[PDB]
């Protein structure tokens, strides 16, 4: 289940982020494949640039533009997503 | 010591990044602090936009501005440093 | 900094001891398992 530690986006876009994370965790095995799936899928619809990091032990320092950011847990993986 | 798994910068810039990371590693024992330190020093050193992720388990897919990217290990910790 | 399942260490000498342990129980088949187990482990510690 999605424990959203830190999000700065609207509700629908957050829900779509969680759904895309679920599909990525279901379909791919290695981490970079999941990251690329998330980033490319959010490039396809939301806005043309995105950045994603999937892992278990990390905390970034980014410069995201407001209204787009998430850092949440799915299963046992931390997914960090932001546009810049 | 330091091994550069991936680089897309000039030799001087990569050397400066390695120096920044090793300098950070003697001050900060929490990983977000290393991310912050690196992000500030490349923020003031270069064109202001930057991004840094540090950890021991993560996989990413970042669209980075050309001629600016690095992914390298110090000790046991991986650092991904790039510009949007 | 444990973050993955495989990080948990299973000692080399663990299972053998455990089997010996269950041996004693299934030899005596007692009812106050906790007391007898405490006595047995304390005996093993004090003799080792």
């Amino acid at each position: 289940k999605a424990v959203i530690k830190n999000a700065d986006m609207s509700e629908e876009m957050q829900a779509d982020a969680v759904d895309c994370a679920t599909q990525a965790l279901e379909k791919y095995n290695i981490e970079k494949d999941i990251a690329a799936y998330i980033k490319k899928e959010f490039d396809r619809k939301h806005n043309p640039t995105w950045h994603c990091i999937v892992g278990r032990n990390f905390g970034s320092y980014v410069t995201h533009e407001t209204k787009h950011f998430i850092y949440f847990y799915l299963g046992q993986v931390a997914i960090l997503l932001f546009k810049s | 010591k330091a091994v550069i798994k991936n680089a897309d910068m000039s030799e001087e810039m990569q050397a400066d990044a390695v120096d920044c990371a090793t300098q950070a590693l003697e001050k900060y024992n929490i990983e977000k602090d290393i991310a912050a330190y690196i992000k500030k020093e490349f923020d003031r050193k270069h064109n202001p936009t930057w991004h840094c992720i540090v950890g021991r388990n993560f996989g990413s897919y970042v669209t980075h501005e050309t001629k600016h990217f690095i992914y390298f290990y110090l000790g046991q910790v991986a650092i991904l440093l790039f510009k949007s | 900094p444990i973050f993955c399942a495989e990080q948990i260490v299973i000692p080399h000498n663990l299972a053998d001891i455990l089997k010996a342990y269950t041996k004693e129980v299934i030899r005596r088949q007692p009812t106050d398992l906790i007391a007898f187990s405490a006595k047995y482990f304390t005996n093993l510690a004090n003799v080792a």
């Binding site: 278990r56 905390g59 320092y61 995201h64 533009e65 960090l80 810049s84 | 929490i30 990983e31 | 444990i2």
Partner: peptide, 17 residues
């Protein structure tokens, strides 16, 4: 743009049992 800091803490993601 605005900044943001995240960090995986100890034991929050990893439920031992």
């Amino acid at each position: 743009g605005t900044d943001a800091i995240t960090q995986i803490e100890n034991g929050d993601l990893f439920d031992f049992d």
